[PDB]
Structures are given as structure tokens and as C-alpha cells.
């Protein structure tokens, strides 16, 4: 079930807000070229007051679109249904083991015409031959998933389309805007037109291995992994026509195919030895990886019958396009690892890799990454054994590095592409190389060429992330109080950055550079208490908490000005958190002509408008008056699992909180203003019914205006809110039938249970939307309520 | 991985398997695990044409 | 370890070292043309119409003042921020066109002429394109960066400045580009999209015409008019040069704006939009995709002003009502009128693009503004709704060529420089105005029966050839440029050349408030609003190497 | 001087289901085996394709259908089948002589 | 549980064939032979230049 649903004006409410917006600006509210007419006048003090309100019956003069009070979110949501079934079976003999499972999932999301499902089989087995010294094994899973996904932007469209627009037009077609009504598409119709854009996805995952133990402590092993998926889909383009929202009469189909084929191969050599007090592992080995991808698709326009049965490429009578390309990479890897344990109380560990990637030139192919960790089982040292209340306590510290090469397969190269221009754009800017050099106006193939996509860099190398870590494990009161702490410092250097080009460089001037650095340090804490009680109740709490800070250390000059990782391209994010943002400081509202004239010069400032702070004190409110106003890093997050067992019943709660987080709300643009949007007459949030006026002087909401004279759309503290939350992620209640009862139906375990996920949300009073975890337009987070069972033989 | 290859050349013995057994059916079966054995083979060949 | 990480290589592209091969040199040339068709969008057409809404010719149109709010700010001269997305956008796009020119020039420079005999005509073509963009950037921003080192490395672009050069020698660096093109282009281009030598002369002249009204001070006012520059406009509009290329005025005005008459004698150089040509929906003029009237559902931008309407009014002898034209609306029954009004402005009661089956009305069906922006439609760039040339992609767009230099421009530009050089050749500038004015008076094919069907009184006459004063002569050329180039997005550009923007537009703001409510709070600030601010992000990335235009605060 | 690349793809899918039920008896010197059961089937084939023309570089990795300039085409079809049946069998020996 | 590989290079130049394979078979009988589940699975990959 859809839960946190956004409150959005209704047809009557829409007309009240509009009258306010008009009269605030001092224009005749009867001049709205929609269907509203207003009986209004002035109060004793001279401020405008609304008396009555009449709406016409149709939105057009020719009466093809009736007037509604449509709740568009209720109209695009539904009660979802989930199903889940899984069977698994296992066998274990002296000479081997064997496992087999079958599974199914099916989930009809709360947004209509979106769903997902999965079929799964897995078989694993292993065999011990000779003297259990030759061993063969296999793990393999096979899966078929299929999905129809929510279109891009339906939540914003549902927020945007006014109640007055009906779901169905008089003729029974889909409803749409006409007359003066805004440029917004019918969101029910979008979802329905997209219901057959289903992909089918087959993934096969598994490995096979051989293991040899030629004598005591010596092992050899070789594993070949296979990871292969393929995805097919027809995407259909049906013709639409919702009022003035038209598509001409375009019909098309695109049959798309993709393949991802990855495989892995390694060989491993390990020695073990136990010398009275010394313990020790050594392991050296080698690994190969390779991915090869391909994708292609055929596109055809114009169909006589508009159903997925007809809409195959062979049956189109219009223009065709063909798409596709491949790519891939490979990795080689040489590694060793060394473990040592003295007297089971001092532990040392050593890792060393040399790692090559096809994504670099040979002059930089490999890089070498060592690692070191130490252990100190304090309690086994004899002077700690005067402490009956502390079972084990172990201090550990580690330093080590890891390469990163997760970059474009083409990162090294200067890329020219033919890009004739066969591909959907938006508003032009296809950047194609075809051109009617002849002046014929077309009708036939044009001459074309090549355009630069990327400048190469001969000396890209491995990026290095380096971590230092320290923590301590503990166990008190004979294993009932347990947990661990963690402190780490984590720095990425020579960071591999897709770096934009300087403006004058022009088309495709970007290049991947090792240029940039970024830290993450923080604390991590686990703590669990568990004990029985002397009336029948077992209780087991185990919670956790953590916090971190992130700081960008250096950055290419053109990425600092870019804003790609931070301050909106007005200030450089070097020295701030990844994703921090700069903006104007909103300092309330001008409430009196007095307060505009005494403020800095502010273009568009009047009574009822946002007062922006004069940060440089220059007596002018201009682009220079912005500062660091947004950081996405919580002060801390935390989780907690309560578990109870009483009298064959069991109860679980899992709580999760994030505390101290800034969110940026873009719904607030739609909820607090009549004109903080590109387009006039959109549906608005229900909060602006409380907008400041002479009438209503106790408010934070700017006075309703029809033009963003004050540019209150500018990034500002007005949109940052406290996105802190605590959520009951899950609660589950269970009964398990006593053994003596189920064991006679030959059942080691029979249990039924009942649960609800995401049932409850605690948030800040200063947050003004619904889900602080999903404050804008992403697929809503539903409340699930579940029943289920467990049977085992 | 071949255990036995029956070839049902007849029609009164292959009539059970379908209408689509007018041209005769070739029944193939695959191997299985015997009782109390753990055997493992390894074949190879390198040829020239 | 090594062969493994080299096997997979880029698919479906040309790499930077390959791109310079001769087999690709002509691909780069074409691609540098292509971006003039494929690089603008509905808010950035290389027509620059979205920005001539500042002019007294037209209003931005659309749903309302928020429908492209940054262009309303431009239209009323208030609440322009240097951070505005359009200003950054147009700056960025125009320099993108420059890229394709320079990339082609970079590889053309290395070509051997003995085995590629068109080497210098191709090179000329590209430098023409490069001048085209630098010219338009210069019009938009005054203080621009000169990007004309096709061998410049990517990194060296960071140390460029919009003040390497003074204002004049910024204009000259443009003139140099079009001059080389004149020296090297062929007289005739059998492939009509390629500029001919006369086009290079035309643009060369236009560059010196804009260069001659000098602003060598710190602000934007006129610091005197240079006649070394003017005598060039004369040299490069010489009729003898234009006749070597076969250019001239179409025998009826409407031909410049009609699909059947593309690449006519007046089209000196045009952007060759095309249909049925292999692309997704066509190489249509998407940049005018907003300006189709409501008859096609959307979007009613670029609507002409009543000011421009009333400007086609004429006195009893067929001459402009210089002083009185805006004091009462154009009334069809009783006013004499210029035939060019019905080729520029589709008006209620009259046919849309010469089609009696589409009569425009003050309706839901034609205008989108409930009357805010009026009820007039821009005729020049739209086309007959029945035309083969008309398709809907994401917007409605045609394949009608956009003409950058009409040969009327060349005659009227020649007229200008002659009038500015008071040197006895004024009766020759009047000779040129009468060329355009008389052609226009007879451009009544396709509207020949408007007297009987609607009542219009066409009445336009040439000026008597007398010994005119320089000041009266300027007024007469100015008026001819008003009626000749209406809605073609160089009216506001003309005013800043003349240093008359504040006086004429601030005045327009008070006269036109009566008819378009938006101008209520409009106010043009001289020595500020004559050019868009250089974009804030651009300056801010420059590390103080860029300098903002005069009148704008230290941000 | 002609360059092109066609990128085919075909797909097949079958699935059956059957539920036999056999019986076995041995009395005296007679044995018999009777069995009955149904059967299901479904075939869902497919294919489609693509086509491009007039490529510049001539190698098997540059010639993907996005690096072309010329005209393009597309193909495709789809087939089907179904079946449902019922069967039976019997056996007899009566003496280990007469089968 | 089987495996396999078979690579053939034809007598006519620049034609070949190669096949990878796998196989898993099993069965499990549970309660005095009144419940028996089993399976048979195969997975190939051939790659022929014609």
C-alpha cells in the first residue's frame, strides 16, 4: 500500500489559490482564461476577501473536456500484491554434498502497471575422491527475471496535472489539458501506454573448481567462474493525444537485445602448518577476468494495428533505424597472503597484489598494493586473567592500499564517432555529422563524418585508496555482552576523474585524468545484549551506530568550477563534503514596505517576498551573496534489532535511523509558491493555501505571486530541510507449532508468521514533505503487510 | 554422456510417443550414479585431418 | 598480465589521432556546417530570435511571463542575473560551432594543395563559419574571446581572455576571417549551402558596418564614427562583386520566406534545413519550434508588437508616418499600408501564410496568452499548414531555409555607410532605398485581392531623388530597415549599433504598455543593458581572466 | 564499393508437462502393466535483425551498426505451436509364453 | 556431473567449430521410496564459422 502521499490542491482549492495570486499582484482574478469566475470584494481594512466561486462545466469552448476534481495520485496508485515461494533440498554423504532450490517472486508495485518477478534454480555439489585429497565441486544458479518499469517523471507529472483535468474526455479518450491549461500529460495514460515495455532477463551464474591436497597442509585449487546475462525487450511507442498533449500520430517499436558475458579464472596455492605454539597460513595465486558486452536493436516506425501483437519490426511501413556496439575489458592479478598467529594471542597478516588492467597502456598497466594487519588477543595474556567478567578482548590495527580502475573501457583513447545522427535527441542538439551539403533538402543519404567524443591520455594509471583502521572486539559476562568498535582513515589518491574540457576546447574535450583526492574517516560501533529470563522470555538485542566525515581534498581546476561534485559551479567543493551545495541565505520574508527599503538592494523585492541575506555587506543582493548551505552527511546513523521468544512465539523489530541530515526539497518549490516553476498554472502543493498576506500575517510561506520577480527559485536555504528520521523497517510475529505436534506430521519445524515492513516513520516537525527518505519524485516507499509460513522435513 | 540409445523403428511400438512419430523416434538417455561407486574418468584426444 | 588488458578497444568511434587523416578532412568540413542546423534548440536558435524580444518589434509570447522567465527578464530589462541559464547557454553553443570550424581547419592546414586543390577554398569556408559565430557572439556579448588558433592545444584555452584585444581589434579579428574568405572563396558555389565569394563580401561589410560605430571608451556609448571602416562597407557591397555571384532582389518580397523559392537570387547565404534526409525527424529548423501559433497546439512565441504593426502605416503619398505612426492603431479601412506588413505579421481576420482556409482570430485557437501578448503571429519563419516541408517532432518545425544575409541587407547596408560618409554619394543611398522600397510596393502577388476581400489600401512610393541632409537621410534608411527586416532578429542589434537603445526602447516601453501589460515595470539601463552580461560561470571559471561588461556588479 | 553489417538474433522456447500413472500386478503366472496420462506442449520461436550501410574503416570491431552512415532496414517474425493429448498402454504374458 | 570441450578446424581454410558443455543429473528418494525428486540439466555453447 502506498503510504506517504503528497497533499496537492483540488479543483476548488486551485481556484482559491489562483484568486489570491491574482489579487495579491493586483490583477483582475476574473481574467484567468480558465473556467473560474469570482465574487469578491474588500474588507473593512481594505485587503481583498473572496466571497463565492463558480466553475464552468467544460475546459474548452467546444465542450470536449469536462471539468473534474480528480485525485491523480489515487488514480495512478493501487494496492500492490507480493508473492513468494521457495523450495530447497540438501543431501550430505561421506563422499560429497548436494543442494537444489527453486524460487519465485512476483511483485505488483503500488504504481499501476509496474511489476517484477523472478524464477530461480540453483544446484551446488561437490565430490571427494581418492583420499579426500582430490576434490571437485560446482556452484550454479539460473535466473529469469522480467519487469515493466515506471516511466521517467510520473510522480512529477501527477504532482503537476490539475484536478480540473478529467481522467477521461467526453468521447471516452484519455483526458488532457485544453484552453489555458498547462503543458502537462495525463499520468494515468502514460503508465498505460508503457505497460507493455517489459524486459526479460536471463542470468546464469556459477563456477566449477578442482582442489588437490598432495600432502598435509598443502592445497592447490583452480576455479573457473561464469557470469552471463542477456536482456531482451520491445519498447513500444503508441500515438497519444491528451487535449493539446500530442505526439502527432507517431507509432514505433524498438526490439532491443543485450548480452553481458563475464568469466573468471584463478589458481591458488596455500600452505598450512601448526608448530606447537606457532600457527601460519601462506597463500599465493593468480587470477584472470574478462568481460565482453554487446547490444543492438532494430527500430521501426508506423503501424496499422496498435497492439504488441502487431508491433513487430517486420510490420512497420515507415522509417527504420539500427543501433548497437560492443565493449569489454580484461584484468590480470597476482597475489599472495600470509597469516601468522603466535600462541593464539598475537596475530600478523600480510597481503600483496600486483594488478593489471586492459583499461591502461602498458607503460602503466600494473600497480602494486600491499596490506598489513595486526592482532592482540589481550585476554589470553596471563595478567588479564584476574577479570572473570571479561571473556575476550582483542585489539587490532591495519594499514593497506587497494587499486581502483572502474572507468570507461575507452578511457585511454581519443574517440571519433561517425554519429550520423540516427538517435532520439530532445530539442535538437543531436550533434550529428550528416549535412545536406548540396542544398537538396534531403530525401536520401547525406554525406557525414566524425565528431570527437573524448581526448585521450597516454598515462592514466591506477587510482589508489589507502585505509588505516583500528578497532576492538569485546565479550563480557560470559558471552552475553558482545560487540566491536571501528575507527578508520580512508584516502583515495590519484583519483581517476572524467574531467571536463575547458570551454574554448569545444566538442568532446573531456579526458580521464589521475587528478583528485578524497578522505573518509569515521567510527563504527556494534553492541548486542542477549539473555534468557526466568518466566519464559528470551530477549536478544543487537544494535549499531556509526558516523563519518567526507572531504574532497584536491580536484582538477575545471571540475572545481564545474560543480560536478559540489558547489553549484559558483564555488569550488575542495575542502567540503562530496555533494555539498552553495546557495543564497533566505532570511525570512519582507513583512512591511519598511523592511524592503532598509534591506540591501534586491531586484524583485517587495512586501511578501523572500529577504535574501547580504553576505558580503555591499548593500546589494547579487550573485556574490551565496555560501555553503547544504551537506548530505548525517551526524550519525543507527540500527537496532529487538528479538523475543516467549511460549513458542517470536517477535522481531528492526529500527533504523539517520540523524542530522540535510535534504534538498524540490517539492517545496511546488508547495510554497504559485510561480516557482517554469510554466504557469501547474498544480500546486496544498501548503500554499497558508501563504502570507495582509489577511494572514502569521506565515513563513511567501505571498502568492504570478511572476518570480524575486527569483525565489534560486538555490537557497529555503529548500534545505531536516531529513532526519527513524523508521520501523520491519516487525514480525511468529508462532511455531510445538515439536511433538508437528513431528508427528513428520515436520522438524512448522511455523507461521506475520509481518509489516516500513510500517512507521518518525521525522522532524521542520520537514514539510511526506517521506524524509524519499522527499521528492522517486518511486514511493510502500507499507507492506505480509503473511507466510515455514515447513521443513 | 550417453547411457543407451533405443531406436524405435516401428509404428506399433512408437505409436505411444505421439502423432509426430511417423518417421520413427530415437530415444536417448543419459548417465546416472550407480550404487556405492565414486568413479571418475578423464578422456582426451589430439587428432589431425 | 598484458595482452589481456589491450584486447578490447573502442567500438564505433574515430580516435583523436585518426581524425586528422585526409580521408576525413571533408567529413569535418560538412560537420562544421551541420552544427548550424543541429546545434541550436528551442531557446537558442542561431536565428537569435529569442533575444530580439528585447526589440520594439515583438514580444516573447508563450503561456505567460514565466514561460521562459529569463527571456521575459530580457524583454523588460529587469531581473537579469549573470547566472541566468540562457545567457550561459547561448555563449556555450556558439563556441561549440567554433569548435567544428577549428577542428576542420586544424586538419585542413596540414593538407597538401597539389593533391587537394580546393585546400584554400575549404579553409576559406571554415573561416567564414568561424567568423559567423564570432560575429554573433560579438553582437550578443560585446566582450568576447577570440578563438582563432586552430592549432591551439586544449589546455591553452584556459589562459584565453575576452580582453586580449581591444573592442575595435576584436571586431577586426572577425573582419580578418571574412576577408580571407572573400580572397579565397569561388565566385559561384554549385553546392548552394557553401558560401560564395559575394557572401564573404557581404558579411565582411556587415562586420565593418558594426565596427564603425565605435565604442572605444569603457562603457557602451558612441565615441565617434570611423570612416576608414565605412569605406570598406562600400568596397565589399560593390554591385560589381554581387553581380559576379548573381545575387539580387526577388521580384516579390514574399519569396525570401517561402519553401518553393529556397536559394533564390536574394538568399546570399542560408542555413540549409532539410526534410526526408535520413535523420530521426529531419534537419528541420527546430530553433523556431516555439513560434508556431496555437493552430498547431503550441507554443505562440515570437509574436510581433503593435509597434511594428503600426510601422507599416504610410501617409497619403506612400511614405512612412515618421512622427505619428504609433498614436493610433492600424485601421485597415482608412489607413494606407505597406505590403510588407502582410508578409511579416499574420493579423486577426487575415490569412495565415497566404491561406484563406486558415483565418486568424482573437482566439483560444491562435494565441495562447488570453490576450496578454496580443493576437499577432510571426509570418516570416512559419509556413502554410498544408506544406510538405512541415513535420511535428517534439515541436512543429519546417525545412524553410534561414537566410543569414538577404541581398536587401546588402543594399541597405551600402545605403547606410554612404549616408554616414557625408560625401556626395547620398543620392546613391536614396537610390538604394528606392530599390528596396519599390520592390516592396509591388510585392502584391499572393495578396493581390486584399483590396476587394478585406479593404486594404496598399500605398508605397520611392523617395524623390533630392539633395537630402544626412540627418533626414538616416531617418529614411532606418525606416526602411524597420519595414524590410521586421521580426528577423536584428532590430535590437541595429539599435545598439546606433547607440539609440535606451532612448528608443525605454520610449517603446511607455508607448506599448497600453497594449502589452508586461512592459508596466520595464526599464532599460543605458551603459548596461546593450549587451547580455558575460555568463557568471564563464567569468568564475576564468580565474579573473574574463572581464564582465560595464554596468554589472562585482559578483 | 559497398559496406554493410547485419546483426541477426533468433530465439526458441519449448516446455512440456505430463502426468502418467502406472499400475503393476503379478498373480498366478500373469503380469500386467496399465498406464494412463496426458501431455502438454508449447513452442514460441522468434527472430529479428538489423542492417546498416556505407562504413568507413573496414575491421570486424569498427563495423557495429552505430558507426555507419547509409540506409538501414529491420526484420523480424514470430511463430507458435501447441499440443494436448492422452495416451495409454497395456501388457500381458499369462504364461511367460504369450506376450 | 560432466564437462567437455571439442575443437575442430576444418580442412577447408578459415572454417571451424568448437563446443563447450556441462551436465548435472541427480535424484533423491525420501520416505521408503514414496517420494522421489530428480533433475537433468545441460548447457552448451557452440561457435561455428560457416
Residue numbers in the entry:
A (entry chain D): 224 to 1016
B (entry chain B): 175 to 223
C (entry chain C): 1 to 555
D (entry chain B): 472 to 570
E (entry chain B): 323 to 372
From the study:
For the levan utilisation system, the cell surface components are Bt1760 (a GH32 endo-levanase), Bt1761 (a surface glycan-binding protein; SGBP), Bt1762 (SusD) and Bt1763 (SusC)15,19,24. SusC proteins are unique among TBDTs in that they are tightly associated with a SusD substrate-binding lipoprotein15–17. Recently, we showed that SusCD complexes mediate substrate uptake via a “pedal bin” mechanism. The SusC transporter forms the barrel of the bin, while SusD sits on top of the barrel, opening and closing like a lid to facilitate substrate binding.
To visualise potential different conformational states, we used single-particle cryo-EM on detergent-solubilised apo-Bt1762-63. Strikingly, several distinct conformations of the SusC2D2 complex are present in a single dataset, and after further classification steps, three dominant states were identified. Following three-dimensional (3D) reconstruction, electron density maps were obtained at resolutions allowing rigid body placement and refinement of individual protomers. With the exception of a few Bt1763 loops (L6 and L7) and the Bt1762 segment following the lipid anchor that serves as a pivot around which Bt1762 moves upon lid opening, the conformational changes between the three states correspond to rigid body movements of Bt1762. Interestingly, the presence of the plug domain in the interior of the Bt1763 barrel in solution is strictly correlated with the open vs. closed state of the transporter; only open states contain a plug domain, regardless of the state of the SusC2D2 dimer. Mutational studies in vivo provide insights into the key structural features of the SusCD apparatus and cryo-electron microscopy (EM) of the intact SusC2D2 complex reveals several distinct states of the transporter, that is, open-open (OO), open-closed (OC) and closed-closed (CC). These structures directly visualise the dynamics of the pedal bin mechanism and suggest that the individual SusCD complexes function independently of each other.
